[PDB]
Amino acid sequence: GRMHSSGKGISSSALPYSRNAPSWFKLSSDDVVEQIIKYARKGLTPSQIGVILRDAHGVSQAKVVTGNKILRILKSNGLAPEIPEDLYYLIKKAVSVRKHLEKNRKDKDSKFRLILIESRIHRLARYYRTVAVLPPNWKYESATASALVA
Amino acid sequence: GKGKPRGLNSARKLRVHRRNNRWADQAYKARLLGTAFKSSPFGGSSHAKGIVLEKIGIESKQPNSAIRKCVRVQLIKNGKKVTAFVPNDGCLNFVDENDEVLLAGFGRRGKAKGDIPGVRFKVVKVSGVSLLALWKEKKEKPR
């Protein structure tokens, strides 16, 4: 179920069985890669890039049309974010909640949700340090929180 | 399920959990606190001796009506005062104030017995001779 609530929703994208591109789709693998690079260079997280590709270029899964996943392609062409986008978005949400809270000191539900969000941030940062994606001594702190999202 | 861990490396939790909950059993708790050594009138002994201080009659509890003859006794080993029942018909006349009696438990390992409230001991011997012998005129009270 949901990690920080009682919800048990199952609404997820359902990947197709076929691992080959459809016969009606004809775009070069090099073309799809350069499209990925163009979208990243303008500035777009891999989730955003995948959404645009699927919506406007018939690119269902970039994996089946390039043989490799988007974030792996970005790392192979020097476009991997310094902070993984999961952690980046969690820190951004925490910054937004903190800035809301500094005015509304009597909003106790916001304080409770801040605790939950920061718990998720620390668990994810722990995971990333374990797989050496983040430096061994990387640490999220609220005082420098706005920097990494700026 | 079952509320207890089953992991194959959970022996510490299981053993410590059993150790904590064994304190809820009276016999284990008594033998590990050493309450017989520290608070039992006999100090853990099966029998004890003492000097008779006074004869007292104790009203039997409901639905019985009687006077159970007993003696107030001061123990020798620790100076404690206990009440002991003197069991048989007319055996109270065999015991007197200042006599030395041998006491035993009263059958229920520290509890009262029957309709006699607050009495947990019984007289076995007086002046070095058993009451069963005196009651049956098998011996004589020494002097």
Binding site: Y17 | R6, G7, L8
Partner: protein
Amino acid sequence: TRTSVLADALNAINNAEKTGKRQVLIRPSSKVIIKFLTVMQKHGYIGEFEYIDDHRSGKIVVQLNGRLNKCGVIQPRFNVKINDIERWTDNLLPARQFGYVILTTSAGIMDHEEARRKHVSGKILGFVY
């Protein structure tokens, strides 16, 4: 979350058996589940079972013949000496002439009589009778 897929499979099999179902769907599947099901099939307790490929973990549909009383897992997978199998068969099995204690051994997954023939032991896996 899911901590033993063998446990889910055997529970689903037993529950479908008790309701009179001729067939049970198992999800997900695994090598251990398939080996255990093979041991149960070789003794006739189950019929044909079929593996569906979903490119994720697999599903299994089993043909139940109604000859099975109980299948279950022994969890945790206790270590068993060669001569501690006696107590496990005494405690888990209806009698000394039918039923099986399934062991995973370095010689492979098998039942306890095969383990005695090969003089091998390992960790207990479950039972069937």
